[PDB]
Amino acid sequence: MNWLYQMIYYGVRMWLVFVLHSFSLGSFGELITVITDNNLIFNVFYIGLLGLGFI
Amino acid sequence: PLPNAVVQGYTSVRGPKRPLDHFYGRTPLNIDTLWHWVKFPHRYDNLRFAVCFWAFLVSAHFANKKQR
Ligand SMILES: CCCCCCCCCCCCO[C@@H]1O[C@H](CO)[C@@H](O[C@H]2O[C@H](CO)[C@@H](O)[C@H](O)[C@H]2O)[C@H](O)[C@H]1O
Ligand SMILES: COCCOCCOCCOc1ccc(C(C)(C)CC(C)(C)C)cc1
Ligand SMILES: COCCOCCOCCOc1ccc(C(C)(C)CC(C)(C)C)cc1
Numbered sequence: 735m736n737w738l739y740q741m742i743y744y745g746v747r748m749w750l751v752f753v754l755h756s757f758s759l760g761s762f763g764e765l766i767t768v769i770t771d772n773n774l775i776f777n778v779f780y781i782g783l784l785g786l787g788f789i
Numbered sequence: 790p791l792p793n794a795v796v797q798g799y800t801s802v803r804g805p806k807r808p809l810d811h812f813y814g815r816t817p818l819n820i821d822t823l824w825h826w827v828k829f830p831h832r833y834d835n836l837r838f839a840v841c842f843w844a845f846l847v848s849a850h851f852a853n854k855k856q857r
Pocket of ligand 1: 790795
């Protein structure tokens with residue numbers, strides 16, 4: 735029975751990891767874009783077009 | 790259509806015209822001799838690019854803040 739338990743536990747763990755990390759990252763992105771849209775001196779590719787994307 | 794006097798510019802006698810002065814030892818100064826002193830802008834072109842960017846950006850910032 736512990737095999738079933740560990741399988742369920744790690745499946746739920748992977749689901750939570752993917753979902754929460756994607757959601758948090760997107761939320762931080764949206765807050766930063768709100769700050770830059772409200773301050774267009776900063777609405778510029780301030781890290782770089784490819785640097786941030788590669789990172 | 791018009792007489793030869795009108796064409797040649799004189800009725801009887803062609804009058805002498807005083808020639809143009811030259812001012813030896815220096816360039817002529819006329820309305821058409823000014824590019825010798827004033828060429829097209831060539832010294833601050835890159836500063837022009839930078840300042841146009843900064844002007845656009847600062848204007849956009851303050852306009853968005855005013856509108857909001
Ligand atoms: C064609 C159909 C019938 C209509 C005919 C009449 C048409 C008239 C309109 C055209 C007028 C042109 O006017 C023209 O002016 C110039 C000035 O620039 C005169 O120019 C004249 O004076 C100048 C200086 O003042 C002299 O250096 C020059 O040698 C002499 O030609 C011309 O002599 C005249 O012909
Ligand atoms: C309404 O606008 C006012 C216009 O005023 C014109 C200003 O004219 C003053 C010009 O003064 C000089 C004098 C000499 C020169 C030199 C001879 C030094 C220029 C040179 C070496 C490029 C030929 C340049 C400018
Ligand atoms: C776009 O142009 C607008 C303004 O144009 C100004 C043109 O100025 C040129 C002035 O011409 C001169 C140049 C030199 C001089 C001096 C007196 C400096 C010459 C000198 C010392 C040799 C006698 C006088 C007039």
